[PDB]
Design a protein around this ligand. Structure first.
Ligand code: CLR
Ligand code: OLC
Ligand code: OLC
Ligand code: OLC
Ligand code: OLC
Ligand code: OLC
Ligand code: OLC
Ligand code: OLC
Ligand code: OLC
Ligand code: OLA
Ligand code: OLA
Ligand code: OLA
Ligand code: OLA
Ligand code: JRZ
Length: 442
């Protein structure tokens, strides 16, 4: 009825507007801020382009097809529109598969979080995805290879006002597997390894980068002591000059209370090295360290880094039970300390690491790991929005009379609405957040 059509009209207009605004913003943000011109964001540009082309050239014509209950745009635009629709989905899922693979080679390289690809190579990859997926999208449609031979389909082909996507089973099966299932299966398989590797490759340096933070200017501790870099304690003296001298001495140049990322990592290495040397020189800590596994050793190094060899050595009953592998018993004693009261968020992560012997407490804490999670969210949400439609479509092939037109259209629009979601997910990135407020003049 009238109220449903007008109400449907408003909702669809907002979907078209949300997709277009959101995706133009992404493209603009990457194009204007150099810090965002990265290989990963070049693939995100490929994905935002598909979503923009979806939002501008696909969804408005689909909306008009639903509202008008017919196709008023002619047979040529009908086949062309359908081809663009398929291209936008094929290109998107292959771009996500490329991201997964790129992230895999990155995490399994000594560079860890940087692409092994150059921007030129990445551009050529994107161009290859779009050309190939465009060839597999447009050719079977223009050539009419997709066409079904039943009368309901045949009548619809000859009718200029009918643009119902009737396809033969071989086309529906073949194009779905190659254009959607194969890249999806590879993406989910490869990206689960990326996540596995980020947890597996967690070390003491990332653990402390997480706990201590990074500051290139002098700041105050929890104890209010002058610090810089990754928890590098400068002096217990309440003089900023005393902190500045000690800094100038450490680095070996006129720092003026500021250091480089190169200098921050340099001090950090010495500190972590000293913590380990201090453990190996302590009679009370060395047997505890020898009995611990790789992960738990990092938790112990962390404590020595924060409190010092002597401080940790005082936890005589905890250390005894760490040695005796009585983790939950050690955890209780460690919780019943001044250390836990002073730094509860850090202590709980360290205590958890001692209990589990895993990195689950440091899961998605690093900014690079947070970027990986964001990319996983993009992939997970695309899959959730498109898979019900693709399953129902390949089930309509096996069992002809499954569910009706209204369910088929609904599930396609679930997929469509995904083109509007990605700009909101990039809001997770602080770099993207700043870019947006800058472009939106907020
Ligand atoms: C209907 C069809 C033909 C239109 C498809 C639009 C085409 C022209 C778009 C979609 C995705 C686009 C690419 C998206 C990603 C990048 C990375 C960017 O840093 C340089 C350009 C480049 C390589 C774009 C070139 C143009 C491109 C291939
Ligand atoms: C629904 C409305 C349609 C969405 C379209 C645009 C709004 C998105 C806002 C992006 C505009 C900001 C671009 C800008 O600031 O311009 C920089 C310029 O390109 C450097 O020369
Ligand atoms: C399109 C969605 C982008 C909206 C931009 C946004 O979320 O704004 C930044 C936020 O206010 C943080 O300061
Ligand atoms: C409609 C299609 C795309 C809209 C996106 C528009 C392209 C993004 C604008 C480019 C831009 O802002 O960058 C200019 C830069 O300042 C100098 O190189
Ligand atoms: C019609 C969609 C147009 C989409 C084309 C916009 C993509 C080009 C782009 O903005 O890429 C970054 C820039 O070329 C790097 O300096
Ligand atoms: C977003 C796009 C909206 C298209 C709006 C145009 C669709 C026309 C409004 C629906 C309608 O009332 O048209 C039924 C018509 O009487 C039967 O031919
Ligand atoms: C199969 C689809 C895989 C698409 C190929 C992308 C290649 C890539 O991402 O690069 C990885 C690495 O940098 C290469 O040395
Ligand atoms: C809301 C949609 C959640 C699905 C995205 C997803 O699969 O999650 C990514 C990753 O596992 C997060 O840790
Ligand atoms: C859709 C409404 C059109 C008005 C544009 C608008 O709302 O502009 C606000 C923007 O954040 C300006 O910085
Ligand atoms: C009417 C056509 C609809 C949308 C066109 C997209 C708007 C492009 C704005 C230019 C972006 C920019 O240069 O800042
Ligand atoms: C076959 C799948 C190709 C991708 C392989 C890279 C990721 C992996 O080895 O797990
Ligand atoms: C199976 C269906 C969806 C899986 C979600 C897709 C996200 C990539 C998998 C990586 C992961 O989150 O473990
Ligand atoms: C949830 C998805 C939200 C909005 C999509 C709206 C499109 C609905 C079209 C199906 C209506 C119909 O059965 O004709
Ligand atoms: C290879 C491939 C790629 C994308 C697909 O769905 C997109 C879907 O919005 C369809 C085209 N829209 C109709 C409402 C026109 C499909 C295939 C195979 C059939 C379904």
């Amino acid at each position: 009825d009238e109220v449903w059509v007008v109400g449907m009209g408003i909702v669809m207009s907002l979907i078209v507007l949300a997709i277009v605004f959101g995706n133009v913003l992404v493209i603009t943000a990457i194009a204007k801020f150099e810090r965002l011109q990265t290989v990963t964001n070049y693939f995100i540009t490929s994905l935002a382009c598909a979503d923009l082309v979806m939002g501008l050239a696909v969804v408005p014509f689909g909306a008009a097809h639903i509202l008008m209950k017919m196709w008023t745009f002619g047979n040529f635009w009908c086949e062309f529109w359908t081809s663009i629709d398929v291209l936008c989905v094929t290109a998107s899922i292959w771009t996500l598969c490329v991201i997964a693979v790129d992230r895999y080679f990155a995490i399994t390289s000594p560079f860890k979080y940087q692409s092994l690809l150059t921007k030129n190579k990445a551009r050529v990859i994107i161009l290859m995805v779009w050309i190939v997926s465009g060839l597999t999208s447009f050719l079977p449609i223009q050539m009419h290879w997709y066409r079904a031979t039943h009368q309901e389909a045949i009548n619809c082909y000859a009718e200029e006002t009918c643009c119902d996507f009737f396809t033969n089973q071989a086309y529906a099966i073949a194009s779905s597997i190659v254009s959607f299932y194969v890249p999806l299966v590879i993406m989910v398989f490869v990206y689960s390894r990326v996540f596995q590797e980020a947890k597996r490759q967690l070390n003491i340096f990332e653990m402390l980068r997480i706990d201590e933070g990074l500051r290139l200017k002098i700041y105050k501790d929890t104890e209010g002591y002058y610090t810089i870099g990754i928890g590098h304690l400068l002096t217990k003296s309440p003089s900023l000059n005393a902190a500045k001298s000690e800094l100038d001495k450490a680095i070996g140049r006129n720092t003026n209370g500021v250091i480089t990322k190169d200098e921050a990592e340099k001090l950090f290495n010495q500190d972590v090295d000293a913590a380990v040397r201090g453990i190996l020189r302590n009679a009370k800590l060395k047997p505890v360290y020898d009995s611990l596994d790789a992960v738990r050793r990092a938790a112990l190094i962390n404590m020595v880094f924060q409190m010092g060899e002597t401080g940790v050595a005082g936890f005589t009953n905890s250390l005894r039970m760490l040695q005796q592998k009585r983790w939950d018993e050690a955890a209780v004693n460690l919780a019943k300390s001044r250390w836990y009261n002073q730094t509860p968020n850090r202590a709980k992560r360290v205590i958890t690491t001692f209990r589990t012997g895993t990195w689950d407490a440091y899961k998605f804490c690093l900014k690079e790991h947070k970027a990986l999670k964001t990319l996983g969210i993009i992939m997970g949400t695309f899959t959730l929005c498109w898979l019900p439609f693709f399953i129902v479509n390949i089930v309509h092939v096996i069992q002809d009379n499954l569910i009706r037109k209204e369910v088929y259209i609904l599930l396609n629009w679930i997929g469509y609405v995904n083109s509007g979601f990605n700009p909101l997910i990039y809001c997770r990135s602080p770099d993207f957040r700043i870019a947006f407020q800058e472009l939106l003049c907020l």
